[PDB]
Amino acid sequence: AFRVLKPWWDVFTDYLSVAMLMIGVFGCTLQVMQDKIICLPKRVEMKGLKTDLDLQQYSFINQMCYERALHWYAKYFPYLVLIHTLVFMLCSNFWFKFPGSSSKIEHFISILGKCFDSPWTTRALSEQAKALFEKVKKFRLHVEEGDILYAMYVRQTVLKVIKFLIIIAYNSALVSKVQFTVDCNVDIQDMTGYKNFSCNHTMAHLFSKLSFCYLCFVSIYGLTCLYTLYWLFYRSLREYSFEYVRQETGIDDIPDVKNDFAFMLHMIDQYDPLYSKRFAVFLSEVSENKLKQLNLNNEWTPDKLRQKLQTNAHNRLELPLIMLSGLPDTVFEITELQSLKLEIIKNVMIPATIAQLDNLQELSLHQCSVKIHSAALSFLKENLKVLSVKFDDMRELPPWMYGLRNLEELYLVGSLSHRNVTLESLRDLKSLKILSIKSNVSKIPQAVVDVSSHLQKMCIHNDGTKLVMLNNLKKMTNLTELELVHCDLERIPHAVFSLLSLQELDLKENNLKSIEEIVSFQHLRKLTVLKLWHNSITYIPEHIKKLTSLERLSFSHNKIEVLPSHLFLCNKIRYLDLSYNDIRFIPPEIGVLQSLQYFSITCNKVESLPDELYFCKKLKTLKIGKNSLSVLSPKIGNLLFLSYLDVKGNHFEILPPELGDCRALKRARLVVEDALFETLPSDVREQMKADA
Amino acid sequence: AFRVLKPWWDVFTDYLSVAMLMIGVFGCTLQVMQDKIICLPKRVEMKGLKTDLDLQQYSFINQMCYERALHWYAKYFPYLVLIHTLVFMLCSNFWFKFPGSSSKIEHFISILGKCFDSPWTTRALSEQAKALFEKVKKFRLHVEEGDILYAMYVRQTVLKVIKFLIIIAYNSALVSKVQFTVDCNVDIQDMTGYKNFSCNHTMAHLFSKLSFCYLCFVSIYGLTCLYTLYWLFYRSLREYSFEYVRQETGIDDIPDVKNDFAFMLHMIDQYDPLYSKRFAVFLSEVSENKLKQLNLNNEWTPDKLRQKLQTNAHNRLELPLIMLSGLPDTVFEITELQSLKLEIIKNVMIPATIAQLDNLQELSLHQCSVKIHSAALSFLKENLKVLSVKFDDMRELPPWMYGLRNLEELYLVGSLSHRNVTLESLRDLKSLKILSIKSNVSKIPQAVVDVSSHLQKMCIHNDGTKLVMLNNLKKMTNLTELELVHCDLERIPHAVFSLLSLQELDLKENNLKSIEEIVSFQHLRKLTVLKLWHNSITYIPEHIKKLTSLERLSFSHNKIEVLPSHLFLCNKIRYLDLSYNDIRFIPPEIGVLQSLQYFSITCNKVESLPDELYFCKKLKTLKIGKNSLSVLSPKIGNLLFLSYLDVKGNHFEILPPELGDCRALKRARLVVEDALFETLPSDVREQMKADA
């Protein structure tokens, strides 16, 4: 604190100053004690020379000739040395005592003491100091733009030099002024009768030697100061470069430091370089990252991870990551999970340690600007089969996923056209079969055709953008199944008819009304499932009877009001969705659809129940919903395989006990009004709720 | 409490004062040791000049001539210097030696240091400081009333300067007064025989030099003090404005400080700008809010939230929040719950993080001034289907909810008419299907018409204000379920007949007496449920028998005493509340009300039971209450499906065992006295209580 700043020569000057003050005080005490110029009158077998002067006269003569004859240097030397040594001490400590420098120095000594103290420094050179990191960077921001400390030190030393020079320059000449004997021609007569006096100065000889001795001190002092001056103008401390500790521990960080930092680090080094090396760590950003990783690993343990382990949508062991900044290493201790979820973790490097986690084929990236390792990338291209990616500003999407070959299913969340898709080529995705698109691109990009060679199912669910050109869609030769949800086509495009291998088609939220292209649909004989959700279809073309291959029909939220009889000409269908439609009556041909196993007319206008409905026993799910039926035909007891029933929201009053014959149907599958359910027999409800 | 108050010039003045003290004390010691006058009689080959004076006479001459001839300043210079230096010390330290100012400055330094050490300062600039914020604001309040510190400091500096002029003024004019030699004509004749004496005191010469040196010191001192004066009249220390820190850290608060606090800031800045910079962060209100939020996040954990996670009245997962400063962010981690209960939480803003909580269809806002994020607003507009708001002064109501379209059920607590109701339009509310109102609307606002297009259910339960106008009610054509609770109508309004789509009707607490408008009610052929709670209805118009669609009837707390036969003609009714009335005898035609499932005559004067009552086996609820009955007809056993019985508070003695036949009626549904219950057979009571 009070020591680590002064190099050897500063303590040298302090010691010389203390010794100099000792010399000066010695001289002062001697002078006060015995300084007695002794005087006699001068002008004149032998006898004495009795001058008959009483003691008072002798003291008076001594005093007078002291003031007159003795040259001022011999009189004033000790106080002079006192002043000079006092000024030297003041100017030595002025660097600390001045507040402008004192603030910076106190800040620096505090921060550097704590930095040298931290054991994480030693660990890195081979837990809470990450705050000291921020303190260090704040401090260097505070003082690097100074250099006033360098100015203060240079001024201090240069004034010391000028003082030493003036001391030698005058004192060398003035030393020879002292004389042991001395003369004085004073007009003391008329009070003693004598005019010409001789005297001897007792201290003279002593002072002479003292001066000489004192002079030696000054000489040494000056040389010391000069060296400092040389050391302050030969190494140019305005800039410092580590270039050794950087090479010592082989970390290319810690580039350089600015002026005041350079100077003060130089000072500390000239005290001891060990403190400089132990300080070198905290400027390293690599050290910062490593300390962050250690701290999070201290916080992140495989226990906590396996606590959060769960199953994804695709029944896979997955660890959610909702809000982080890096990858805890403890996850690399968990090779069992085969899915991984990451939400909004930028600035992430994927290590090769994922190679330990081979048992994984699914990954999730929700707006995470993340890059990979080379071995990590190879591990992805050789192991992963499924990937879900959410992105917002294209920054979270790095290109390397376009190289993953063994991936089989892909999910995308984010707009590309912002209307051409800024989509890279989907060619290296050699094993992809499933593609999920969540964007607003008006056109299907050519990159889709880059994967069409092995693409089996591709799903686009835009936000309402129209698929303006469907030319690339016609290239989906390998496309086994096709979905066009909310593509705003409003019609049946010709591209769909280009895919004979198509099995299941959805046009949800496309608001189709004129669907007379069913003729082209009989061109596609693999069409087993057709879905027309939320479409303005108020009428059903007769060409639907020509699609024998159909197995499932979706027409929820459609303006059909009366279903034509030709609808029933395709008995192969097993699933029938007609809910939220204007349907008011069921034609009896509902009987021929024996293979039907599902039905839904929730929130429709159906008021009557044809009895042929009770002939398709394969119907296991019935959803009347909020319709206008008022009586339930007992023929419901004929449909034993009906497992689900949704008549709630209708005008029934009493439920016939024929519901007791429905073994597949229970209260779980029975959606009825509580009052209507109460009308059922006690035995029926006991058998229906449980085993009675 | 000692260092940072002194800028550089104060330290310089302190050192000059110290060194001046050194000069003075050195002079004092020398004067003690050496200051002797030496005197000789003046007026008179060469010989001695014997004066034949014994030592006593010489000493007496010394005393006399020293007292007379030697000028006082030469005699007292060191003591004068000591006095002036000491006064300088005292007038320098009078700042802190005054207790009133001492408390202020000491507290200032304590809190400033503490603020400097606070790591939360660093975090903000990037735990327990929450307490320190209050101390900070209390202190700034306590000190921004002063400026006595600045005035006293100005007084100190002017005192120092004027004393400096005084010192120079007379020392310059008296320095020449000291003289080595000196003369004295003293009339000591007849006592030592001489009159003219010459003397010299040894110190004179030295003192000259000393004075010169001393002058220089004081001169420099004055110069430094003079600078302070310039520094006290050029910066206008009455005000401090950061405007750089306010720009550096980008925090627009910390406006300014008053003269006293501004002056202290100027001092600290002169010591170091960084102290003031770091201290400014604790004046930020935004920083304080962030600290409060962080602290409540520290106090709250998702486990604590899930501790009170429960079901609401409308069976939804919800967490109570009764009193808070904001949202503990942990709530954003819990997405399963679809409703949140927040009460009396002002200045809350819901971020985009609500989008994490997609499983959401209900909400609660009890007098909470809450703003929203943009993504938050979209999430409310798209996800919510039910919502509860309590507001008091329309400020807790956040207007943006008038823009939510997908909401379907909304309940409001808070007056509107206040009787002009400043209710905003219910137009952007597109998907609403259910509405509850708790206001003071004497008028149905036009805003309801903007939701009447899509309206399905609306319930107004004003605090009793008469809904005088109801033309907007006539615009509720699409309305299906209507309730008018405590609307103080006292009569059947014509607006009700304007709503043919109406299914359920309520006029509770409207205190209707004359209800002869039932004729227009059979205009409403969709009228399923009709309620007449707490009405003054003396009797029953026959037009009620003309309501074909009657299903449920309420006559709670009415002045009805005898009921007519035509009332029973609407056998379609299943619910019949007649309690708290003057009923005494039930006409036997109660039998035709076979479809009736409910009955209540509690707190009436009924004295006999027609047996045709027991014909309506559909009657499952029976609330006789406290009436004037004495015996029970065994035909109650005919009511096998009777599930409830309230006979408590009557005059029975022994009940028929036919109660054992009623399978739906058990001991729990049998509201009876215990002594009377004992009169029943043990088998019946065992069967009712348990399965024996």
What is the residue-wise DSSP string for A358-391?
A: -S--EEEEES--EEE-HHHHHHHHHH--EEEEE-
Q: Flag if A193 and B48 touch (Cβ within 8 Å).
A: yes
Q: Flag if A53 and B53 touch (Cβ within 8 Å).
A: no
Q: How far apart are CA A578 and CA A602, in angstroms?
A: 8
Instruction: Copy the structure tokens of residue A251.
Output: 């970390």
Q: How far apart are CA B183 and CA B68, in angstroms?
A: 10
Q: What is the dihedral of CA B512, B518, B521, B527, to 10 degrees?
A: 70
A191 has a chain B CB within 8 A of its CB: yes
Maximum alpha-carbon separation in chain B: 176
3-state secondary structure of B620: coil
Contacts (Cβ under 8 Å, ≥6 apart) of A34: A202, A203
Q: Measured between alpha carbons, how far is residue B424 from residues A527, B362, B427 in Å?
A: 52, 22, 9
Contacts (Cβ under 8 Å, ≥6 apart) of A664: A620, A640, A641, A642, A643
**Minimal CA separation from A663 to chain B, in Å:** 27
Cα–Cα nearest to B444, from B462, B463, B429: B462
A618 has a chain B CB within 8 A of its CB: no
**Minimal CA separation from A43 to chain B, in Å:** 9
Residue with tokens 């400055």: B105
B117 has a chain A CB within 8 A of its CB: no
Task: Indicate the residue type of A151.
Answer: A
Cα–Cα nearest to A658, from A637, A639, A674: A637
Element at A196 (helix H, strand E) = strand A196-200
Q: Flag if A142 and B53 touch (Cβ within 8 Å).
A: no
The DSSP letter of residue A494 is T
Instruction: Copy the structure tokens of residue A302.
Output: 């495989």
In chain B, which residues have their Cβ closer than 8 Å to the Cβ of A192?
A: 40, 48-49
Instruction: Copy the structure tokens of residue A687.
Output: 């058998």
Q: Measured between alpha carbons, how far is residue A111 from residues A6, A131, A150, B129 in Å?
A: 18, 12, 19, 22
Q: How far apart are CA B546 and CA B570, in angstroms?
A: 8
In chain A, which residues have their Cβ closer than 8 Å to the Cβ of B198?
A: 191
DSSP codes of every residue in B300-336 = --HHHHHHH-EE-TTS-EE-EE-S-SS--GGGGG--S
Element at A423 (helix H, strand E) = none
Q: How far apart are CA A675 and CA B520, in angstroms?
A: 30
In chain A, which residues have their Cβ closer than 8 Å to the Cβ of B48?
A: 50-53, 192-194
Phi, psi of A500 (to 5 degrees): -75, -30
Q: How far apart are CA B360 and CA B84, in angstroms?
A: 82
* Residues B361, B384 contacting (CB under 8 angstroms): yes
Cα–Cα nearest to A502, from A479, A485, A483: A479
Question: Who among B7, B39, B200 is closest to A64 (CB)?
Answer: B200
Cα–Cα nearest to A20, from A202, A201, A177, A160: A160
Cα B15–B20–B25 angle (5° rounding)? 125
Q: How far apart are CA A645 and CA A659, in angstroms?
A: 10
Q: Measured between alpha carbons, how far is residue B480 from residues A171, A605, B446, B507, B528 in Å?
A: 117, 17, 18, 15, 10
3-state secondary structure of A513: coil
Q: How far apart are CA A282 and CA A132, in angstroms?
A: 8
B664 has a chain A CB within 8 A of its CB: no
Q: How far apart are CA A82 and CA A101, in angstroms?
A: 27
Q: What is the dihedral of CA A28, A30, A32, A36, to 10 degrees?
A: -130
**Minimal CA separation from B522 to chain A, in Å:** 21
What method was applied to determine this entry? cryo-EM
Q: Flag if A99 and B180 touch (Cβ within 8 Å).
A: no
Task: Indicate the residue type of B404.
Answer: L
In chain A, which residues have their Cβ closer than 8 Å to the Cβ of B180?
A: 67
Any alpha helices (H) in B403-510, and if so which ranges? Answer: 447-452, 471-474, 494-497
β-partners of residue A459 are: A436, A483
Task: Measure CA of the first residue to CA of the last residue in chain A; give whole Å.
Answer: 89
In this structure, how many other beta carbons lie within 10 angstroms of the beta carbon of residue B676?
17
Q: How far apart are CA B472 and CA B452, in angstroms?
A: 9
In this structure, how many other beta carbons lie within 10 angstroms of the beta carbon of residue A162?
11
* Residues A573, A594 contacting (CB under 8 angstroms): no
Residue B482 CA, distance from chain mean position: 40
Instruction: Copy the structure tokens of residue A382.
Output: 């050789």
Residue with tokens 């001395």: A182
Task: Indicate the residue type of B134.
Answer: E
Sign of CA dihedral B204, B209, B212, B218: negative
* Residues B567, B590 contacting (CB under 8 angstroms): no
* Residues A207, A10 contacting (CB under 8 angstroms): no
Q: Which residues of A637-662 are buried (b: 16+ CB within 10 A; e: fewer)?
A: bbbeebbbbbbbbbebeebbebbbbb
Q: Flag if A99 and B205 touch (Cβ within 8 Å).
A: no
In this structure, how many other beta carbons lie within 10 angstroms of the beta carbon of residue A284?
20
Burial of B563 (0-12, 13-18, 19+ CB in 10 A): buried
Cα–Cα nearest to B28, from B203, B171, B163, B217: B203
In this structure, how many other beta carbons lie within 10 angstroms of the beta carbon of residue A672?
22
In chain B, which residues have their Cβ closer than 8 Å to the Cβ of A651?
A: none
Residue B591 CA, distance from chain mean position: 64
In chain A, which residues have their Cβ closer than 8 Å to the Cβ of B55?
A: 55-56
Q: How far apart are CA A23 and CA A213, in angstroms?
A: 9
Instruction: Copy the structure tokens of residue A150.
Output: 């360098």
β-partners of residue A412 are: A389
A322 has a chain B CB within 8 A of its CB: yes
3-state secondary structure of B353: helix
Q: How far apart are CA B467 and CA A159, in angstroms?
A: 96
* Residues A461, A485 contacting (CB under 8 angstroms): yes
**Window 238-297 of B, Cβ < 8 Å to A:** 270-272, 274
In chain A, which residues have their Cβ closer than 8 Å to the Cβ of B49?
A: 53, 57, 191-194
Q: Measured between alpha carbons, how far is residue B257 from residues A117, A188, B91, B152 in Å?
A: 39, 74, 28, 19
Length of chain A: 692
Task: Measure CA of the first residue to CA of the last residue in chain B; give whole Å.
Answer: 87
Q: How far apart are CA B469 and CA B464, in angstroms?
A: 14
What is the Cα gyration radius of chain B? 51
Resolution (A): 3.7
Q: How far apart are CA B187 and CA B196, in angstroms?
A: 9
In this structure, how many other beta carbons lie within 10 angstroms of the beta carbon of residue B439?
21
Q: Which residues of B497-522 are buried (b: 16+ CB within 10 A; e: fewer)?
A: bbbeebbbbbbbbbbbeebebbeebb
**B414-418: long-range contacts, CB 8 A cutoff, minimum separation 24:** B414/B389, B414/B390, B414/B438, B414/B439, B415/B439, B415/B440, B415/B463, B416/B440, B416/B441, B416/B445, B417/B441, B417/B442, B417/B443, B417/B465
3-state secondary structure of A530: strand
B333 has a chain A CB within 8 A of its CB: yes
Q: How far apart are CA B45 and CA A516, in angstroms?
A: 161
Cα A513–A515–A521 angle (5° rounding)? 155
A141 has a chain B CB within 8 A of its CB: no
Burial of B665 (0-12, 13-18, 19+ CB in 10 A): buried
Do the strands A481-485 and A457-461 form a parallel or antiparallel pair, or are they unpaired?
Answer: parallel
In this structure, how many other beta carbons lie within 10 angstroms of the beta carbon of residue B86?
14
**Minimal CA separation from A214 to chain B, in Å:** 22
B19 has a chain A CB within 8 A of its CB: yes
Instruction: Copy the structure tokens of residue B58.
Output: 């010489």
Q: How far apart are CA A314 and CA A408, in angstroms?
A: 13
Contacts (Cβ under 8 Å, ≥6 apart) of A316: A337, A338, A339, A361, A362, A386
Do the strands A310-311 and A317-319 form a parallel or antiparallel pair, or are they unpaired?
Answer: antiparallel
Cα–Cα nearest to B487, from B433, B443, B538: B443
In this structure, how many other beta carbons lie within 10 angstroms of the beta carbon of residue B192?
19
Question: Who among A56, A67, A195 is closest to B205 (CB)?
Answer: A67
Test mutation, A57, A88, A392, chain B, max B CBs within 10 A? A57
Cα–Cα nearest to B425, from B405, B396, B403, B441: B403
**Minimal CA separation from A172 to chain B, in Å:** 23
3-state secondary structure of A462: coil
In chain A, which residues have their Cβ closer than 8 Å to the Cβ of B272?
A: 99, 103
Test mutation, B34, B37, B49, chain A, max A CBs within 10 A? B49
Residue with tokens 């309305």: B479
3-state secondary structure of A506: strand
The DSSP letter of residue A427 is -
Length of chain B: 692
Q: Flag if B8 and A99 touch (Cβ within 8 Å).
A: yes
Taking 3-state DSSP, the helix, strand and coil percentages for chain A, each rounded to the nearest 5, stand at: 45, 10, 45
Q: How far apart are CA A558 and CA A536, in angstroms?
A: 6
Cα A316–A319–A320 angle (5° rounding)? 115
In chain B, which residues have their Cβ closer than 8 Å to the Cβ of A53?
A: 48-50
Q: How far apart are CA A325 and CA A327, in angstroms?
A: 7
* Residues B532, B507 contacting (CB under 8 angstroms): yes
Element at A481 (helix H, strand E) = strand A481-485
A192 has a chain B CB within 8 A of its CB: yes
Instruction: Copy the structure tokens of residue B124.
Output: 């903000």
* Residues B512, B536 contacting (CB under 8 angstroms): yes
Q: Measured between alpha carbons, how far is residue B641 from residues A682, B250, B665, B685 in Å?
A: 12, 76, 7, 18
β-partners of residue A576 are: A553
B403 has a chain A CB within 8 A of its CB: no
* Residues B649, B625 contacting (CB under 8 angstroms): yes
Query: Within 13 A of A127's CA, how many CA atoms are on the CB side?
Result: 3
Q: Flag if B205 and A103 touch (Cβ within 8 Å).
A: no
**Minimal CA separation from A41 to chain B, in Å:** 9
Catalogue the E-assigned strands of A566-674. 575-577, 598-600, 621-623, 644-646, 670-671
Q: How far apart are CA A60 and CA B607, in angstroms?
A: 148
* Residues B586, B606 contacting (CB under 8 angstroms): yes
Q: Flag if B200 and A63 touch (Cβ within 8 Å).
A: yes
β-partners of residue A365 are: A342, A389
User: What phi-psi label fits residue B427: left (phi over 0), alpha (psi between -120 and 50 degrees) or beta?
Assistant: alpha
Q: How far apart are CA B270 and CA B5, in angstroms?
A: 9
What is the Cα gyration radius of chain A? 52
Question: Who among A51, A99, A191 is closest to B40 (CB)?
Answer: A191
**Minimal CA separation from B56 to chain A, in Å:** 11
β-partners of residue B341 are: B320, B364
Q: How far apart are CA A25 and CA A42, in angstroms?
A: 35
Instruction: Copy the structure tokens of residue B16.
Output: 């000059």
Q: How far apart are CA A630 and CA A625, in angstroms?
A: 13
**Minimal CA separation from B566 to chain A, in Å:** 25
Maximum alpha-carbon separation in chain A: 179
Instruction: Copy the structure tokens of residue A228.
Output: 């400092």
Q: Flag if A194 and B8 touch (Cβ within 8 Å).
A: no
